[PDB]
Design a protein around this ligand. Structure first.
Ligand SMILES: O=C(NO)c1coc(-c2ccccc2C(F)(F)F)n1
Ligand SMILES: [Mn+2]
Ligand SMILES: [Mn+2]
Length: 264
């Protein structure tokens, strides 16, 4: 079933979501040419543990050995922080954070552009964030999750990009992954009517090239099959009585935290 969070549960999701957003805000001035993804991981984990008094949900997840995932360029997801992998001018890089605080999870990611943007890098990051934002503006009681997936896929494909099918957003709360599955494309299997107090993520992975992906021999790193660039942004939300509240909003987001469809 899909759990409906109590007001107290929602407040705990606000705290966890704020913490996960705050990791992303904290790490920003370290994301520069020449830094290793392994150092960025250590800076995040020390912050989560020592400052936030929280835990990373990534560490030990199915045996995953690091505290965040960092995905550069044609790495779609689950890039493993490594001391030998250096950021460089023109890179696009996703940093994906999940923190557990007081039993609740907050899950969020963004792209950073390192030094001077690529014109595809700029555009792929912007359109991927806008695909997330257009989905967030659709969330309100009574809409079907299926409409939202279809809208994201229409928007991304109109820009000549593709949506990765293997991964989806998800319910979230005391579990890192709960019902429902939030697909970022249209499917006949999606039939979920949203109600106030559902909490879930929207997190499209968008390739500049074709949709197919492949996993490296390391068992974790996922890349586009065509080696096109790939981008992702993720927010955790709660459905409210007339819209949604974005639990993981950052100062650099350009969508409001509270979206309401009442008035009109
Ligand atoms: O919901 C997720 N990210 O937003 C998610 C789901 O599984 C994972 C995953 C999968 C493989 C390796 C590492 C991870 C995780 F550590 F959780 F980020 N992330
Ligand atoms: Mn995530
Ligand atoms: Mn997620």
């Amino acid at each position: 079933a899909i759990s409906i969070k109590t007001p107290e549960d929602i407040e705990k999701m606000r705290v966890a979501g704020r913490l996960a957003a705050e990791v992303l805000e904290m790490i920003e001035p370290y994301v520069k040419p020449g830094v290793s993804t392994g150092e960025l991981d250590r800076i995040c984990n020390d912050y989560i543990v020592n400052e936030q008094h929280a835990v990373s949900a990534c560490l030990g997840y199915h045996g995953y050995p690091k505290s965040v995932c960092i995905s550069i360029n044609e790495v779609v997801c689950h890039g493993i922080p490594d001391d030998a992998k250096l950021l460089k001018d023109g890179d696009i890089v996703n940093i994906d954070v999940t923190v557990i605080k007081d039993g609740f999870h907050g899950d969020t990611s963004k792209m950073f552009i390192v030094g001077k943007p690529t014109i595809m890098g700029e555009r792929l990051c912007r359109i991927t964030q806008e695909s997330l934002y257009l989905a967030l503006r659709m969330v309100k009681p009574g809409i079907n999750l299926r409409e939202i997936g279809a809208a994201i896929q229409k928007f991304v494909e109109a820009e000549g990009f593709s949506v990765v099918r293997e991964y989806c957003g998800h319910g979230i709360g005391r579990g890192f992954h709960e019902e429902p599955q939030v697909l970022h494309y249209d499917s006949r299997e999606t039939n979920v009517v949203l109600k106030p107090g559902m909490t879930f993520t929207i997190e499209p992975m968008v390739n500049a090239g074709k949709k197919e992906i492949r996993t490296m021999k390391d068992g974790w790193t996922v890349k586009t099959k065509d080696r096109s660039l790939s981008a992702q942004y993720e927010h955790t939300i709660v459905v409210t009585d007339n819209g949604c509240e974005i639990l993981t909003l950052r100062k650099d987001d350009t969508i409001p935290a509270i979206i309401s469809h009442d008035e009109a």
